[PDB]
Amino acid sequence: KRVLSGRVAVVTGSRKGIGLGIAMRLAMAGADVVLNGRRQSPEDSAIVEKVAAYGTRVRCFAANMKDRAQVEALIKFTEKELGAVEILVNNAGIQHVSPVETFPSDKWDEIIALNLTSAFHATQLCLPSMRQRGWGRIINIASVQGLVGSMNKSAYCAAKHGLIGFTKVVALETATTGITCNAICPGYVYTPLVEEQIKAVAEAKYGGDMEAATQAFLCEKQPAKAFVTVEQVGDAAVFLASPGADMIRGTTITVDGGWVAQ
Amino acid sequence: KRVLSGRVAVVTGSGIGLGIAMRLAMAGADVVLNPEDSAIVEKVAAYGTRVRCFAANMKDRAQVEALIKFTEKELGAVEILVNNAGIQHVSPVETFPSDKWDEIIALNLTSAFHATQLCLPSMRQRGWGRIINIASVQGLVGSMNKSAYCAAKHGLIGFTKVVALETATTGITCNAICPGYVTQAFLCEKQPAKAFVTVEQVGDAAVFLASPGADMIRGTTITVDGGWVAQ
Amino acid sequence: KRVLSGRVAVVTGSGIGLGIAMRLAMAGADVVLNPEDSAIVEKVAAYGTRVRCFAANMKDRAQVEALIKFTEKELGAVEILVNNAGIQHVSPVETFPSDKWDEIIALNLTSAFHATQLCLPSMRQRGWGRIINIASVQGLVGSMNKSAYCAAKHGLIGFTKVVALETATTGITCNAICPGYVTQAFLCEKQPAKAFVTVEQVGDAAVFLASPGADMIRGTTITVDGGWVAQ
Amino acid sequence: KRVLSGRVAVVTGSRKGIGLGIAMRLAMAGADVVLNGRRQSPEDSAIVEKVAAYGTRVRCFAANMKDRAQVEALIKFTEKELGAVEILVNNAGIQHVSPVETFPSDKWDEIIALNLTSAFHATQLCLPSMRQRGWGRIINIASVQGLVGSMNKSAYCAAKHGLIGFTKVVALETATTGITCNAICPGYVYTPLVEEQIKAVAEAKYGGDMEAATQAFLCEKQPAKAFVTVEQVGDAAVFLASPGADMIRGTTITVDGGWVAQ
């Protein structure tokens, strides 16, 4: 009795934050959801209850998306519990603010592996089932940082640009099938990833004042002067997964409050 | 009970506008328009919505004013503005008549400016609004013998960005939808999906843009092209 | 002896056009134009080039025809076309006068179309040509209170793409140059480099586009903005 | 007596092909050039003679750009022989045509490392000297595949998009200095990298006919129906290195014959 009823979806990362909203909105649309995260159980029970409040099957998994073996384990676990993976949301990623000169190479490697190559592993593993079933959705959670650059985020911007290019290529390789591949480019969304940066800014320039730090953080980049919600990103993902997006391929849905428009 | 129930919308052209109006009505909005077409327009009224027909030339600003006033007296304050008035003339730039260039700019580019200018104060007062501009992939990439059309679509996208920026802090959003083609070789040239884009899909994109989920979607494009612009 | 020696060029506006003409003359081209400005224009003739002044309203097509004929009789067949005619009006879209919107579109967008249409057959016959359209960063991103300007610049870039595609297989190329601002806070808002863009740099970009190295540069933008569009 | 006289430039890869043309045009502009390549000496003497025909100092080095130690060795060797690195042209890269499903992960890693991360290592190593000298140029040889996607080139498109995003970030981090960072996006250029693909296409669809294969290869993507030359890419690099590009930052110079315009 719902648009996504019976669909099995897999969110690869960000159990808290954007991944949470995406999972909630996919479950609201009737899809079973598997939430993957790099954490074990801080508040994961509350997250799973929030997702399962919509009466769909919900599962929780802990795979390091930098390890292809663990990505394959995640896919096979989803197949065992729910069924063939039909909606792959690649949302893993981290952030590290640093100028290029002092940017650690290990952090560059970590950001590339988690924000770019994990999507490659997950897509490579899930595409055969989607092709055999004749249907599939691959939604990559890119960033506005994948369309433009920001200071001291070289690795993140590179990985996000790369994830957009990968989206284009995958969409082209599947253009004639019922499988569509697209990307979402959110602006600032209040998440632990963004909360950490806000706290750093507050302690650096604003005497530890989180309110002023948040104000400056948004006013720098987002003309709307307000955060994008995880619910809105989830709505964008639901739209991309719906039949109306059957011919939406290789493009970007940007939810940024005007960040990129300027 | 629906996402768009209780909303007043106008489509300035059509026949993508027909599909946009149909999908908006299915979402609950009350829509205004501008042998088979008559059947489809009568069918649009079959979703419990107040649908009104109209025929206004969007080249004349006074006629746009008349359409807006007719909408706001017949149904109520305009809350969704779907600018879809457009004409296509295929010709090399050397032999492109200036009359058709002016007509294309007026109907595809300036008409949206007039309609937005007329409708914006009402949305400002009401604190909410959706301005959906029906551009095309020709507004992002170029195509041969489409000088006026591509220029108008690019300008429309630029105007979309500007309007969205000017209303970033309000409840009004402005965005553009860029469709592709709506037998095999013609699609193979431009659309790698080798299938057309239905008017229903464009209407779905418009409904999504008008839905609450797009409250923070401002000044960007929604490309429904089967991968045309991805290459 | 120079890269552009023996080339006939026209700049349709100015005062970036002055710098463009100066750098073109330094490269050896013979240029046509359209208290300190007089000194600079007299200085432009100090590079052994045949420089001619002119004052044509680019809104009227007949005046564009007159300028082209004057160029091709005074100096020779037009080989470089630098469209730089433009006017800026800053105003919110709600209060934006339609007259200024039409003027901006006519001077920034349609004038380039007329000039290109007039000049293209000569380049086709001669098998060579450069059409350099002076857009701006406002043609790529949006800015508040720049509705007409941003729309016109976006349309100009689209027309650039179309013209380049129509002449891909010939020796004629079409490209666009997008400059930024040409005290601290105003640059900090948009240009992260916090320094202006000289007219000399825009002229250098035009000279590069016109040089042989750009024989395969077609339909793209050259952005001289200190990083404005990179964010 | 030349625009780039006294400038020390380092080309990181593609000794044959685009790197050759870039080195030649930089030498013509008066700059000393160090050519780095993953090969030892097939025809490197002819390449060095072609570059040195313009009367500037020329050096040859063989560093694997996937190894940061070798990149540092290259930079230090340039400093020892010629002087501080002032014009860094990041041009290393390879290609591997394959659908996502069958794309080897090792080839993905190699393409990412050589086409994206090598630029990060070289830039990180060279930026301090440029900042201390108050001048510098960083030219990244991206591709049209960094602005759009092509089938069976997921790794290449991802890496090239990433290199463009990295260009944006580096330009932003140096916007107030005399150091500019930009990217060049060439279309098809007849090089061994492109010759190999052409030969594969010829043997696959055209009975081994290189002429028809080349025709189809160009007609697929480039409206101009002709190759971009290495000399033209070199000219774009020279323009980006010239004073006229003092305020060109974080942008792309696309030499593609109209590929991206459509």
Automatic annotation (TrEMBL), chains B, C:
Q: What is the lineage of its organism?
A: Eukaryota, Discoba, Euglenozoa, Kinetoplastea, Metakinetoplastina
The molecular function GO annotations come to: 3-hydroxybutyrate dehydrogenase activity; 3-oxoacyl-[acyl-carrier-protein] reductase (NADPH) activity
This protein is called 3-oxoacyl-[acyl-carrier-protein] reductase
The Gene Ontology biological process terms listed for this entry are: monocarboxylic acid metabolic process
For this protein, the record's InterPro entries field holds: 3-OHbutyrate_DH, NAD(P)-bd_dom_sf, Sc_DH/Rdtase_CS, SDR, SDR_fam
Family to which this protein belongs? Belongs to the short-chain dehydrogenases/reductases (SDR) family.
UniProt keyword list: Nucleotide-binding
- Residue ranges spanning the membrane: these are none
Q: Which residues bind NADH?
A: I16, N57, M58, N84, Y149, K153, V182
Q: Which organism is it from?
A: Trypanosoma cruzi
What PROSITE patterns does the record tag this protein with? ADH_SHORT (PS00061)
EC number of the protein: 1.1.1.100
* Segment forming the signal sequence: none
Per the record, what are the reactions this protein catalyses?
a (3R)-hydroxyacyl-[ACP] + NADP(+) = a 3-oxoacyl-[ACP] + NADPH + H(+)
